[PDB]
Design a protein around this ligand. Structure first.
Ligand SMILES: COc1cc(OC)c(Cl)c(-n2c(-c3ccccc3)cc(=O)c(C)c2-c2ccc(F)cc2)c1
Ligand SMILES: Nc1nc2c(ncn2[C@@H]2O[C@H](COP(=O)(O)OP(=O)(O)OP(=O)(O)O)[C@@H](O)[C@H]2O)c(=O)[nH]1
Ligand SMILES: Nc1nc2c(ncn2[C@@H]2O[C@H](COP(=O)(O)OP(=O)(O)O)[C@@H](O)[C@H]2O)c(=O)[nH]1
Ligand SMILES: [Ca+2]
Ligand SMILES: [Ca+2]
Ligand SMILES: [Ca+2]
Ligand SMILES: [Ca+2]
Ligand SMILES: [Mg+2]
Ligand SMILES: [Mg+2]
Lengths: 439, 418
């Protein structure tokens, strides 16, 4: 029961760098891949083996692939503290990036390297007794993150069919955006990928940026700060696959309980508690307190107001000092609050899980080591607010065909821009249809 | 001599089944290694009903363990009595069912079902006179829910003249942990209505309130709830495992409990003087299913008392409750309450009372499920997960109709007069 992570572009690679660093600390894997606590050498059916393969020498190798169309970012990995952890074939780099151009990442530069990426992925898959699916980390805005990811997703649908594909996407934010055409790249990748991904977790950089300032007193956050925080959400989601437990979810479970309709598969994550060490000092937070924090809009990962929408499904993943009795009471209270509205076609609307391994913080980080934490994955109609903001920015530029020549110069037709935008128009409509009360 | 075959499917079924074998192994004096170290000899007169006897006078449960994921399978073998089970009777997959009834019934469970029947067949051929099957499972998941009812359908095709019992955990009115449980439960109930002779309805919310309110367990766990179920499962099988004449085999029990074939869903109960025991077992607060017996009428009832007690006092106290609450017993099935007594008490208790009731109030549970199910199906919410495994929408419509029919039937007899 195994998962392969694919990290694409600067954002995906740099996010993976934080996630795999956290995985090693959670499992006690050293930067050279050795895990002393593991006594089954060269193999095993342990829970952590879903994400780590093993060699006869006792090394624990991530079941991951790093791909970028320029080597600047992945070279850090090849020389960083965790360079020994990855086999050289796992890290794949071109020589010329996509220049914030979806078309270059999909057609011009992407096709140069797609076949090699699939071959290295296939070698990882052949090392599997049973493969659940793929975890794809990328950014909506970059040329490689959008253009190449869409090509990879389409190719994966062919080589592996209906096998699960889950995305971790980075929604553009002007605070740190390095491209004016990011709206074009996001609408195009979303449309191209929309029918290939079974579930996509979006993260709005602006939301993370505000959370880091407010909750962690970080006066001017950097990608390092943001990426560690994303890692906690990714760690919590994968915790049920990497750690052995009786109250876990797996890819198939929480997919089946979060996605009511194929196109409506964009939940927004919420994590709690996000606290600095100063405030954590002499302050321990209860299961109910962190459970209530998940429904406060301030702690969301996409700028939106769930109060102005309706919940269709909530997945609450607790980890740490959490007892079933506390969890049941917390969710019981939520079901009494009327500020939290569920659609009328979802009476049972809570998937629940508990893992007993406590959260881990990387040394030198800003998050405090807490005893219990919770991640909530909620599919609410409020997420459509995010699509509306990005579609409006798409419209403003496309009305004047601004920047479109860069895409036509790389082979695309104006039809793909309207075709993609009409798909987003339908999706915006689908999100209001599902929010209407039944007859 | 009249042997029963036990099957446990899914994470829920296996956990409950494992503690069932812990309780009755202790009651029959079997230790984890499979050797008898007991005091009385009534422990062995009917041991062959649930245990095979193997070389060396070691007793091995006639149990088959099933699940589409290996996790809970490994916990069973590491448990207290995990050593006792026949290792060839562990039949497990690797994928899991993902709370998908279609996966357990049609795709992922289909690939594993024949491997299960091969163990079933091998056990049944080793029976002097096979009696029937009993299954433990939940209706909210995908393995015990979906694959469980597949095994039931397959087993009937090979053993159509044998009794089929089930211990089924039903969805609860207010506590749930899976979003699609209305779909999985409604699809299983459709199966059980057609392919089971007796079904015991258990819901966890009732068990949890007992654990929290009555036994005063401040932080109950599935561990604490399962101890209640295993105690009850021991009580309902006492007449099958110890010498007696009343409801001494599965068919005789079914013939005394099931006046109409589709209305075979029972409300179990357990308790905890003789007058005190009899009052408790009838109380709503001692029922394991979330249905008030005072919201319906009892078609039939079976009470089992265990331990040393004055049968005169018991017989007199059972009659008072019947004559005290005549309104809650159908007038057109005379003498529909049957009482049995066994001298062997459970461990920790000296006197126990187990209650089995076929009450029309059970329709409330089937209405709760139907209401939830329709709310989802009218909008086809979460349906793509099922049609994606090959199902058609009309399989859902039929399952809904059958349960709505089952609810109508229960009401029909709740208002019948003489
Ligand atoms: C049925 O759906 C459930 C929902 C739920 O939270 C809303 C909980 Cl906590 C439980 N649950 C769990 C558990 C299950 C899945 C994930 C994590 C924990 C473990 C456990 O030992 C006990 C006793 C219970 C339980 C059962 C019936 C109750 F009335 C109250 C609590 C079950
Ligand atoms: N959270 C987070 N976002 C990032 C990071 N790096 C880039 N981004 C975002 O990604 C978008 C730009 O895409 P990039 O990842 O930089 O570009 P790329 O994927 O390498 O593709 P090319 O531009 O063709 O090289 C912007 O919206 C940035 O805000 C990161 O390390 N962390
Ligand atoms: N009593 C009890 N019920 C359980 C347990 N685990 C799960 N359940 C019930 O079963 C449902 C989850 O289904 P599950 O057992 O995982 O189904 P599976 O997919 O077939 O294994 C929940 O609604 C619970 O009420 C357990 O250990 N004890
Ligand atoms: Ca190992
Ligand atoms: Ca090793
Ligand atoms: Ca298969
Ligand atoms: Ca065969
Ligand atoms: Mg780049
Ligand atoms: Mg589970």
């Amino acid at each position: 029961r195994e998962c392969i992570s694919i990290h694409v572009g600067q954002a995906g690679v740099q996010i993976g760098n934080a996630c795999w660093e956290l995985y090693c600390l959670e499992h006690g894997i050293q930067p050279d891949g050795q895990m002393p606590s593991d006594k089954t050498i060269g193999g095993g059916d342990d829970s952590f083996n879903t994400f780590f393969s093993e060699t006869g020498a006792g090394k624990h190798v991530p079941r991951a692939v790093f791909v970028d169309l320029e080597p600047t970012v992945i070279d850090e990995v090849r020389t960083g503290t965790y360079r020994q952890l990855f086999h050289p074939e796992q890290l794949i780099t071109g020589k010329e990036d996509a220049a914030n151009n979806y078309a270059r990442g999909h057609y011009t530069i992407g096709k140069e390297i797609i076949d090699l990426v699939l071959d290295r992925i296939r070698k990882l898959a052949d090392q599997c007794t049973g493969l659940q699916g793929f975890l794809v980390f990328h950014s909506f805005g970059g040329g490689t993150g959008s253009g190449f990811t869409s090509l990879l997703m389409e190719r994966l649908s062919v080589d592996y069919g209906k096998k699960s594909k889950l995305e971790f996407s980075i929604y553009p934010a002007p605070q740190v955006s390095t491209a004016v055409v990011e709206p074009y790249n996001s609408i195009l990748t979303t449309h191209t990928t929309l029918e290939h991904s079974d579930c996509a977790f979006m993260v709005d950089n602006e939301a993370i940026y505000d959370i880091c300032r407010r909750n962690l007193d970080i006066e001017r956050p950097t990608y390092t700060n943001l990426n560690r925080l994303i890692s906690q959400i990714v760690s919590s989601i994968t915790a049920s696959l990497r750690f052995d437990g009786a109250l876990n979810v797996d890819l198939t479970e929480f997919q089946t309980n979060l996605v009511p309709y194929p196109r409506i598969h964009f939940p927004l994550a919420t994590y709690a508690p996000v606290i600095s060490a100063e405030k954590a000092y002499h302050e321990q937070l209860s299961v109910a307190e962190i459970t209530n924090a998940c429904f406060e809009p301030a702690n969301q990962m996409v700028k939106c107001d769930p109060r102005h929408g309706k919940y269709m499904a909530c997945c609450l993943l607790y980890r740490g000092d959490v007892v079933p009795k506390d969890v049941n009471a917390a969710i019981a209270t939520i079901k009494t609050k009327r500020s939290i509205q569920f659609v009328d076609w979802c009476p049972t609307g809570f998937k629940v899980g508990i893992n007993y391994q406590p959260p881990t913080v990387v040394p030198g980080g800003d998050l405090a080591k807490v005893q219990r934490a919770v991640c909530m994955l909620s599919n609410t109609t409020a997420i459509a607010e995010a699509w509306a903001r990005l579609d409006h920015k798409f419209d403003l530029m496309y009305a004047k065909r601004a920047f479109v020549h860069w895409y036509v110069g790389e082979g695309m037709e104006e039809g793909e821009f309207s075709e993609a935008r009409e798909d987003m128009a339908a999706l915006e409509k689908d999100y209001e249809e599902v929010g209407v009360d039944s007859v | 001599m009249r042997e029963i075959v036990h099957i446990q499917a899914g994470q829920c079924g296996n956990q409950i089944g494992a503690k069932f074998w812990e309780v009755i192994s202790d009651e029959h004096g079997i230790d984890p290694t499979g050797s008898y170290h007991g005091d009385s000899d009534l422990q062995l007169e009917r041991i062959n009903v649930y245990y095979n006897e193997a070389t060396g006078n070691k007793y091995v449960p006639r149990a088959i363990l099933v699940d589409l994921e290996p996790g809970t399978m490994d916990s069973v073998r590491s448990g207290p009595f995990g050593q006792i089970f026949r290792p060839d009777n562990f039949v497990f997959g690797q994928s899991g069912a993902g709370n998908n009834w279609a996966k357990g019934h049609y795709t992922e469970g289909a690939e594993l079902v024949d491997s299960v029947l091969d163990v079933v067949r091998k056990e049944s051929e080793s029976c002097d006179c096979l009696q029937g099957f009993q299954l433990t499972h939940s209706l909210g998941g995908g393995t015990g829910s979906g694959m469980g009812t597949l095994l039931i359908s397959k087993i009937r095709e090979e053993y159509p003249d044998r009794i089929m019992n089930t211990f089924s955990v039903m969805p609860s009115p207010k506590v749930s942990d899976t979003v699609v449980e209305p779909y999985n439960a409604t699809l299983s109930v459709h199966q059980l209505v057609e392919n089971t002779d007796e079904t015991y309805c258990i819901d966890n919310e009732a068990l949890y309130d007992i654990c929290f309110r009555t036994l005063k367990l401040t932080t109950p766990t599935y561990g604490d709830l399962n101890h209640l179920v295993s105690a009850t499962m021991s009580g309902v099988t006492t007449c099958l495992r110890f010498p007696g004449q009343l409801n001494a085999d599965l068919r005789k029990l079914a013939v005394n409990m099931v006046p109409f074939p589709r209305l075979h869903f029972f409300m179990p109960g357990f308790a905890p003087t003789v007058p005190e025991l009899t009052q408790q077992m009838f109380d709503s607060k001692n029922m394991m299913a979330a249905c008030d017996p005072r919201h319906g009428r009892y078609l039939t009832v079976a009470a089992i008392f265990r331990g040393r007690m004055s049968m005169k006092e018991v017989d007199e106290q059972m009659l008072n409750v019947q004559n005290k609450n005549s309104s809650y017993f159908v007038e057109w099935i005379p003498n529909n309450v049957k009482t049995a007594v066994c001298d062997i008490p459970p461990r920790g208790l000296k006197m126990s009372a187990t209650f089995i009731g076929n009450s029309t109030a059970i329709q409330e549970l089937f209405k709760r499920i139907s209401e939830q199910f329709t709310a989802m199906f009218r909008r086809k919410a979460f349906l793509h997960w099922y049609t994606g495994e090959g199902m058609d929408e009309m399989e859902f419509t039929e399952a809904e109709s059958n349960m709505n029919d089952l609810v109508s039937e229960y009401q029909q007899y709740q208002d019948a007069t003489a």
